[PDB]
Design a protein around this ligand. Structure first.
Ligand SMILES: C[C@]12CCC(=O)C[C@@H]1CC[C@@H]1[C@@H]2CC[C@]2(C)[C@@H](O)CC[C@@H]12
Lengths: 249, 12
């Protein structure tokens, strides 16, 4: 039986996105963070177009569609950037975009060196675990469905069924074989990898929120869409109204 | 979130 789910994921996977960073200016806090915010804005456009093409996604209430996107973009973009870093520079640097690659100096200058280190460990996991492109696509799709309000969504029922289905699809393409233990071990590793994305996203969420607050004082520009989500949705996560869905406790 | 809504509505 010819697969379909994976055909779709591979087909809709977003292409290359540039930050628009001018690599001629010195590496300053203001210049680096302003370019990261622009990349986030451009990437948010692809995240939306991508999500809309995902199987079952349009069957969610429009407001729930907005919500999962507003809540999970950080995790999605970090996971993807870790994959690019792993495949383009063997996780040696953070490959945010072709025109915005962070080396050690930029990690320090960004004032988020610790968070960059944690992102680099994430990227390296793709190597340590030997994550296949298929496993990567399925895990990334599941991240879209990994954060919701504690009060639930407008149509929680359908969301829970869609989430379930994306889990079964992940289970189906895990790299294993005559050895049920290997498959069991593999699923454990992948669920653990997905969970580890959340604490990273949370640090970045805290950082960007604080940055937005003092943006005028540190000369960091926030595009319209990022400004809006960072000032309305991100606080709901930081205040505990919206929480990640973990596999493990 | 007007801009986000527009990106979702446009083409579907
Ligand atoms: C999501 C982005 C941009 C897209 C990407 O490849 C990952 C990266 C992770 C750090 C984010 C950044 C967008 C802008 C943020 C949110 C800054 O304000 C501070 C942390 C930045």
């Amino acid at each position: 039986s010819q697969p379909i789910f994976l055909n779709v994921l591979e087909a809709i996977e977003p292409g290359v996105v540039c930050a628009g960073h001018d690599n001629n200016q010195p590496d300053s806090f203001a210049a680096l963070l302003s370019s990261l915010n622009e990349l986030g804005e451009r990437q948010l456009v692809h995240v939306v177009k991508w999500a809309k093409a995902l199987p079952g996604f349009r069957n969610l209430h429009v407001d729930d569609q907005m919500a999962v996107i507003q809540y999970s973009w950080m995790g999605l973009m970090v996971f993807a950037m870790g994959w690019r870093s792993f495949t383009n520079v063997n996780s040696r640097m953070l490959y945010f975009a072709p025109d915005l690659v962070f080396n050690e100096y930029r990690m320090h200058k960004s004032r988020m060196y610790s968070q960059c280190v944690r992102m680099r460990h994430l990227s390296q996991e793709f190597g340590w675990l030997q994550i296949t492109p298929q496993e990567f696509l399925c895990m990334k799709a599941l991240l879209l469905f990994s954060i919701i309000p504690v009060d639930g969504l407008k149509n929680q029922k359908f969301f829970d069924e869609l989430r379930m289905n994306y889990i079964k699809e992940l289970d189906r393409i895990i790299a294993c074989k005559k050895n049920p233990t290997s498959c069991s071990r593999r699923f454990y590793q992948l669920t653990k990898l997905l969970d580890s994305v959340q604490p990273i996203a949370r640090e970045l969420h805290q950082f960007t929120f604080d940055l937005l607050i003092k943006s005028h004082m540190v000369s960091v520009d926030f595009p319209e869409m990022m400004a809006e989500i960072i000032s309305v949705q991100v606080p709901k996560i930081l205040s505990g109204k919206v929480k990640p869905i973990y596999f493990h406790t | 979130n007007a801009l986000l809504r527009y990106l979702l509505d446009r083409d579907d």
